Amino acid sequence: WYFGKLGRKDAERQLLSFGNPRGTFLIRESETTKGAYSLSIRDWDDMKGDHVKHYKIRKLDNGGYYITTRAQFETLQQLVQHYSERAAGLCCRLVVPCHK
């Protein structure tokens, strides 16, 4: 999936779009972090209802990508595959990718 390098505003307006069930995710390029990635997940809550949290995907200089220090992945494709099954410490698991 190549979403692109877009801002939180653009990621939010897209994720929170009707036609996507909660657990919508996209990975945009982080403009705040040095060419990194942001796993932008659309959560649902009753009080925090329909909000996006972006997990900052970090990169091992001598390795691959990791969202957390719990475990590092070979590639970004592995990172999402784990969260597609289970949240494993995230707020939500990955349900569906966002539509452009």
Structural domain including 82 reads: 1-100
Q: Is 19 left (phi over 0), alpha (psi -120 to 50) or beta?
A: left
Q: Distance (Å, rounded) from C-alpha 92 to C-alpha 100? A: 21
Determination approach = NMR
Which DSSP symbol is given to 90?
A: B
The sign of the dihedral angle between the CA atoms of 43, 54, 65, 28 is positive
Q: Distance (Å, rounded) from C-alpha 79 to C-alpha 47? A: 29
Which DSSP symbol is given to 80?
A: H
- Read off the tokens for 70: 């719990």
Q: How many CB atoms lie within 10 A of CB 52?
A: 20
The backbone torsions φ and ψ at residue 75, rounded to the nearest 5 degrees and listed phi first, read -150, 170
Give burial (CB, 10 Å; 0-12/13-18/19+) of 39: buried
Give the gyration radius of the chain's Cα atoms.
13
Helices assigned H by DSSP within 1-100: 8-15, 76-83
| Strand, coil or helix: 76 | helix
How far from each other are the two terminal CA atoms of the chain, in whole angstroms?
11
Question: How many structural domains are present in the chain?
Answer: 1
The CATH number covering residue 11 comes to: 3.30.505.10
C-alpha triplet 43, 40, 48: angle, nearest 5°: 25
